[PDB]
Structures are given as C-alpha cells and as structure tokens.
Design a protein around this ligand. Structure first.
Ligand SMILES: [Cl-]
Ligand SMILES: [Mg+2]
Ligand SMILES: [Mg+2]
Ligand SMILES: [Mg+2]
Ligand SMILES: [Mg+2]
Ligand SMILES: [Mg+2]
Ligand SMILES: [Mg+2]
Ligand SMILES: [Mg+2]
Ligand SMILES: [Mg+2]
Ligand SMILES: [Mg+2]
Ligand SMILES: [Mg+2]
Lengths: 118, 218, 244, 43
RNA sequence: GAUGGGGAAGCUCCGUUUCAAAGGCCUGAUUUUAUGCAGGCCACCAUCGAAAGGGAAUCCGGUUAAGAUUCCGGAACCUGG
RNA sequence: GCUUGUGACGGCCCGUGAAAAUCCACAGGAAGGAAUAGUUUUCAUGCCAGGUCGUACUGAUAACCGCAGCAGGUCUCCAAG
RNA sequence: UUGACAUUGUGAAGUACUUAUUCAAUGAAGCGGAGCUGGAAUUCAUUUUCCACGUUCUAGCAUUCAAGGUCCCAUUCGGGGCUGAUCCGGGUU
C-alpha cells in the first residue's frame, strides 16, 4: 500500500490531448474585418473642423464604431504616411464616431488636407 | 561532529506540531470506492443461503495449476490459425478444443457429453451460474468451482468466459484427465449433499468480534 | 378570515434575525485527540460585546496540533475570566474557572455552563447570562451523569459531554427596568422584528380569533388544546392550570 | 506605502514597524526568564 | 443565483459548500520541442449585487456662436513593462 | 464672529455603532552569492505605453411626474452687510 | 393523532446482536485489540487483576520529508532505507 499523509483524495492528473480534427471548421479564413479603408470612413469638413486644421494641426475624421484608438492611429499612418501625436475620439449624437487626430510638429495638417482633396 | 547537536522533538499533547504520519486508514475515499468495499462486507455479515454459500469453496492452488495445464493443451484456434486452415481447404483433421459459452455448455451437460466442467466464482449476476452445480450433480458430470472468470477467458481468447468444459480428450491425455476427475470429485461432487445443508456468512466485524470475545471471557 | 400574525412568522421574510453585527457563533473547540486524552492551553486575547446577546464573549486562541498556525475560538465568557488568562481544555484539565472538562471528570456539586447535550455538539445548555448547570451525581455504569438545568428540570447526560467551569457572566441584567418604550425599541432592533405587539382583542374577527364584538373580550376559553391546528393556537396552549 | 522607501516604513530594531519598543522589551525579558525557569524544572 | 445532488406528471422547486474523484503558480527537470515529465506549496472551491459605501494617479492660466479638471500652453503624478 | 476641517477629552446604552478587494511591515532562513569581481531596479537619473463606454442642455410657477407652458409633487452642495 | 400491514433481518428467556433504516461531527488525525515500560497491588507459585505511561507561577517562542544514531551510493554541491515516532485489523468517529 502507498503512504497517504493526507486524508483527502483528489482527482488524479491524466493526459489531455490537443484537438486533431479530420476536417476544417470553415475551410476558408475570413479576410481582415477592419483594414485601413474600413477604419477611416471619410473626413469631416465642417467650418469648425477646418479651423482645427491650420490652427491646431489636427485632422478630423469619421471612423467606424468598432475601431479603437490603436487602430485609428495605425490606419492614419498607413493611408497618409504621417506621424500621429495623439488621438481623441467621441461618439456623436447621430450614432457615428469622430476622431481628433493631431499630427506631430514634423508634419503640417494643412498640407495633408490639401493632398487628400479637401 | 563538534558542530552538530542532538535535539529530540517532543510529540506529546500540547508540544511541537505532529509529524507526517500514514493516514491511509482515515482517507475519505470516493463514493464508488466505499460502495464496493461495503458491498463485500454486507454480503458476509448476513447469513448466506447454501445455494450461494457453496461458491466460497474453490479449487486449491496445486490442483488448479494442474487443471489449467491440461486445459492449455486444447486452446481454441486463433483467427491467425483460422486463415491458414481456410486457404488449405475433409482435408483437415478432427479438432480437439475446450468448449465454452454458457448456453453451449449447459446443453452439453444435459446431453451427457461433458467430461469435466469448470465454473467461475466471480459472476456478478450469480443466477447465471448458480444452478450449474445442481445440474451437473443430477446428470453425473463432474464439476469444479475455480477462481477467476478472467483466467477462464484467457484460455479461450476472451476477456471473460465464466464457464469451460472438455468433451473429448486425446488418447495421450486420458490418464491425466482421469487423475484430475478423481481429485475434483472428492472436493465438490462428493460433498454436495452436506454443503447444501450449510449456511454461510454471519461473520462479525473486527471490533464487534473483540466486544463479543471480551463479554464471553469475563 | 386571513392568515394570523403568528402564522406569518414561519415564512421568514421580515421576521429573520438581524445578524450583521454578530461577532460569530459561540462554540467550544471541536472534540479532538488532545481534548479526549490530555489537555490543551489557550489564551484569552480579548473580551468583547456581542450585539443581541446579553452575555459577553471571549476570544481564545489555541495552537493547531497538526499545522503551524493559530486557531481562534469564540467562547461565552464566565465570571472572573480576564484578558491574558490561560484556559485549559481537555479531560486532564484542572478544576478552575474558565476551564473546559468532561462532566465525568468533576465532583458532585460543580457549577458548569455552556454544557453539551451530546459529546461534540459544542455547547447547548446554560448559555444565557447568569445561568449555570449543577451536577448532582454520577453513574459510572453506562457512563452517564445527572445534572440540574436552569429551568429546574433534571436531565441525564453522557459523561463525555464537556462544560465550562463557572457561571455565565453578565448576570443581573433583567433586574433593571426598561422604563421607556425607546429602550425596548433599541433592544429588539438588534434581535428581530417582534416589537411592539398588538393585542388580539383589539383586532377584527378576520385578523384574530379574539377580534370583534361590541366590547373587547375573548368570548371563549383562552386555554387551547395541544391538538389544535395552525390559526387556532392563540392564547394559552395546553395549559395545565391558570390564575395566579 | 508601495511608493515610499523602506526607511519610512520600519525602525532599526527587531519587530521594527510591527511592535513598539516597550512591547519588544517585554517579549525579550519574558522569553529569557521562562526558558531559564524550564531548565530548573527539568532538574 | 448556476454547478454537485434531492424533489416534482411537468412548466420547474429546494439549496450555495451543500453525502462530489470539484483546482493551478513558483520552479526543477529538457538545449531532439515544446513543455512531456520530478518534489512541495496551497484546498479558500461559480457568478451577479453601490454613477451617495470601499477605491492607484492633475493642477493653474488661456481659448468657442455652442466644448472642456477632457482642447491649447506651461507644470506634475500613478500603474504596467 | 460665520462656515468648515481637525486634535485632545468628557457624557450616554439590557443600543457599544459593515464587509471585501487591495497595500505594507515583521517573524522565519530555503536559496543565491566577492578579487580581478557581483548584487541591488524599496537611492538618483534616463526609455515606452496606457484601451472601451458616459461627457451638450434643463433640473423645474415652461425642458421631470400629475391628459397641459397645471399655485400640486420631487434627493443634495456653496451662503455678503 | 391512534391501530394494522409493508419496509423487516438475527439470538435468548418468561431482553441481546448488527447489517437495513435514522441522527451528528470532522478540509474523515490518532479507533479497536495486543505488546512494551512503571505504579497500585495480595500473592497462595506467577502475575488470578486494576491505573498511569513527555505539556499548569509569567499576554514570549514552536513551520523547511527533524536533529541525532545507524545502513547503502561510488564522493560533489548531495541522494536513498531503518530508527527517532512499538505491532496487528483498513470499521473515519
Ligand atoms: Cl395580525
Ligand atoms: Mg471619451
Ligand atoms: Mg377596531
Ligand atoms: Mg375567525
Ligand atoms: Mg375559537
Ligand atoms: Mg435556485
Ligand atoms: Mg460586481
Ligand atoms: Mg458649458
Ligand atoms: Mg456640462
Ligand atoms: Mg409623462
Ligand atoms: Mg402618463
């Protein structure tokens, strides 16, 4: 007989095998649900928003409701080849998300805005 | 040696913390463990009727070893041996093998064809085999209650067999079979009348036995 | 009629005990190897007030026999027990106030409290303030002990049952008049919802068997038999006698 | 307390920051005298 | 208010650590590869429940038609790495 | 002086006036460690990041509830001569 | 609430047992029997019996499979048996 110093019996540890399915779950992986073109929807060109471009060096965009600040910062850099200092976001009363993107001092928001087309 | 010291510990009540001891006697075992141990106890505390109590007697080690030695000479052919026989094929000699199967063996006993029947003592639905000693006694077929349904199965290439019988033995083994039958008959067939009148069980527990013995003495 | 007041208490909705401020259940140590063979020493760390309980409680710390740690127990303090005192519990403990001993290890006439009805239930008898149990005799055959209970009844208890030497502290509490409804309010605020009490004769017949009538009166004998059913047992239940 | 140095949270003595000096003094004296008393009880 | 269990023809009811084999972080072992495998530790044993209870850390000045202890300027602090 | 914070005290109870997450210290001594070399990120300085949702306004003899732009009802902070 | 039947067995006399059933406790830790060691003890040939068998002036301290003793490894930084801590029955009490 074994020596049991404890009077409590516990469930023994047994081998657990990883899954080895014989057919794939879906067989076609889905493409990126949030790429750069889905994160950034369209610029906002209101009079108040345009005042922040040449004065505050800040670009204003309408973004998807599913995008966080990490994704917004990454999308702006890839689409426009600029550097982002910080991102501030809010949910508008009409159900859309607006992001205040401030570029670093090495870039001018007005030059980027003209290149985009607005 | 000059730096080491002897500092015995005091393990009395109120002294140092008790050391690790073997607590296997006090282990809170799982539910399935307790029920199978208490099932054994309950069946022996009650009085066992003679029909069931006759299965407490099994063939002794010496004669059982000789019994399986003879039966191991008549193993049924395996599937591998079956394949070679089929491709060769009355081109094959008459086979000699141990008969098994509860329905098959019972029919053999009723037709006076079994020369020796082995009975397992571990059949949980005991009614399956509880009538065999009486049936063999009525038909005059010698029988032996042997220990291990797993051991009976291993000589017929099965996990369990619960019964085995020899109907026809080769000439070179006639003397060995007759020697075994005489030894087996003296233990089971010849004692059937007296065993049928004896009840089993009624054994007390270890602590209850001491209490009864103490009262008897003083 | 409708369900009467004493029937509604069993549902336990607003009639449960108010146990937020309770210090904990007051129990003896679990009967173990040290208690039934020798003794174990504890120390009184503090004596504290318990909400809803007249008698004070004592916190006693013992060492764990099988593990390196400390185990704290909640006892009902007896008169004379003080902080820093050593408490001895077990079969081989001395006959001193505060010690816990089996009933069969003390002589006749010993005063004990927090007595076990059965060995190991950790105290059931003589727990209220100023109450005690008197041991009146021993029966070494069958291992039984005869005691007198605070109500005056005589009970036969096993000699292995434990008890604390002394008398429950805080006695004399009920000798002081409450003197105002406000003090009664604060008393039951820490116990349960049973105060104030409206008399049955002041109710309507739908509310109570005593209700109704052009005068306030019961109208039938208030002595109710033991065999009555719920909704009828109001008044004096199975009274052997009445009057002063 | 996690933002300050260990100096602010202890005193250079046994049980520093846990027990005061007088309580530590009582523990040392009690420990010595009791252990001496146990020897005379042994013999 | 789930689970384990016990009720109920059943929708469901009881109960919350309960008659349960109820679980995972410090590593050592391995340079075939990622963690199989050696001791021990700990048994607490779902979860929900506060924009007035408990609680890591920011201030001043300026700026709009409507925003700010959230933006701008300056000056700090906390947590994780 | 007013408002408020706080300290040391005093009166009162058959009323003696939450819990948990979380952080720290101590006891203990398992391990790891120096001479041509190491440990301390509980001393100082330096580097990086900090997601998600709410945030406008009324708060009442006109933005809440009473069929309404109803003399009704609806919790609270600041308080000059 | 009272009676009958079933659950429902076992032994004795003119109540006894255990196993069903019921109650309670413990993260089922020390139960039952026996053997050591001593005491009481009076022996009517030897132990016919019974008890105990590490802890009480003091608000300290008590944890690293335990030091010691002894037996192995193939000596390295260590490791493993037995004893310390008496045996037997696996009925947690
Ligand atoms: Cl009522
Ligand atoms: Mg925001
Ligand atoms: Mg009225
Ligand atoms: Mg009525
Ligand atoms: Mg009436
Ligand atoms: Mg429920
Ligand atoms: Mg929550
Ligand atoms: Mg504003
Ligand atoms: Mg606002
Ligand atoms: Mg409305
Ligand atoms: Mg309406």
């Amino acid at each position: 007989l074994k020596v049991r110093t404890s009077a409590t019996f516990r469930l023994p540890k047994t081998l657990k095998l990883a899954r080895a399915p014989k057919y794939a779950s879906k067989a076609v992986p889905h493409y990126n649900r949030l790429d750069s073109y889905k994160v950034i929807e369209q610029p906002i060109t209101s009079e108040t928003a345009m005042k922040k471009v040449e004065d505050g060096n800040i670009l204003v965009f309408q973004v998807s409701m599913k995008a966080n600040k990490y994704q917004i910062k990454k999308a702006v850099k890839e689409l426009y080849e600029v550097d982002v200092l910080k991102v501030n976001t809010l949910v508008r009363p009409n159900g859309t998300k607006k992001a205040y993107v401030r570029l670093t001092a090495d870039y001018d928001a007005l030059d980027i805005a003209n290149r985009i087309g607005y | 040696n000059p730096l080491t010291h002897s500092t015995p510990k005091n393990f009395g009540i109120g002294q140092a913390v008790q050391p690790k001891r073997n607590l296997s006697r006090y282990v809170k075992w799982p539910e399935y463990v307790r029920v199978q141990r208490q099932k054994k106890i309950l069946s022996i505390r009650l009085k066992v009727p003679p029909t069931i109590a006759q299965f407490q007697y099994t063939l002794d080690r010496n004669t059982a070893a000789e019994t399986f030695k003879l039966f191991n000479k008549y193993r049924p052919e395996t599937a591998a041996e079956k394949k070679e026989r089929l491709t060769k094929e009355d081109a094959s000699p008459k086979p000699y093998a141990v008969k098994y199967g509860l329905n098959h063996v019972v029919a053999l006993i009723e037709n006076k064809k079994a020369k020796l029947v082995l009975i397992a003592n571990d059949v949980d639905p005991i009614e399956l085999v509880v009538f065999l000693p009486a049936l063999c006694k009525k038909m005059g077929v010698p029988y032996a209650i042997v220990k291990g349904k797993a051991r009976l199965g291993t000589l017929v290439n099965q996990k369990t067999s619960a019964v085995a019988a020899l109907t026809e033995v080769r000439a070179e083994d006639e003397a060995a079979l007759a020697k075994l039958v005489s030894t087996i008959d003296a233990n089971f067939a010849d004692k059937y009348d007296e065993v049928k009148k004896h009840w089993g069980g009624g054994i007390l527990g270890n602590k209850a036995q001491a209490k009864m013995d103490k009262r008897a003495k003083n | 009629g409708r369900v009467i007041r004493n029937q509604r208490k069993g549902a336990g909705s607003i009639f449960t005990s108010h146990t937020r401020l309770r210090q904990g259940a007051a129990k003896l140590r679990t009967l173990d190897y040290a208690e039934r063979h020798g003794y174990i020493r504890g120390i009184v760390k503090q004596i504290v007030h318990d909400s809803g309980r007249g008698a004070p409680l004592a916190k006693v710390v013992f060492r764990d026999p099988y593990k390196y740690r400390l185990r704290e127990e909640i006892f009902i303090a007896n008169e004379g027990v003080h902080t820093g005192q050593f408490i001895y519990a077990g079969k081989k403990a001395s006959l001193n106030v505060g010690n816990v001993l089996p009933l069969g290890s003390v002589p006749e006439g010993t005063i004990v409290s927090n007595v076990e009805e059965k060995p190991g239930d950790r105290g059931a008898l003589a727990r209220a303030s100023g109450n005690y149990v008197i041991i009146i005799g021993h029966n070494p055959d069958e291992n039984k002990t005869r005691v007198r209970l605070p109500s005056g009844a005589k009970k036969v208890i096993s000699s292995d049952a434990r008890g604390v030497i002394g008398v429950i502290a805080g006695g004399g509490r009920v000798d002081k008049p409450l003197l105002k409804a406000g003090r009664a309010f604060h008393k039951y605020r820490l116990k349960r919802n049973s105060w104030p009490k409206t008399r049955g004769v002041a109710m309507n017949p739908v509310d109570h068997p005593h209700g109704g009538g052009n005068h306030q009166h019961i109208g039938k004998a208030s002595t109710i038999s033991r065999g009555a059913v719920s909704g009828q047992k109001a008044g004096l239940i199975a009274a052997r006698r009445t009057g002063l | 307390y996690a933002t300050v140095s260990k100096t602010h949270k202890t005193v250079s003595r046994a049980y520093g920051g846990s027990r005061c000096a007088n309580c530590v003094k009582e523990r040392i004296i009690r420990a010595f005298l009791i252990e001496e008393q146990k020897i005379v009880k042994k013999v």
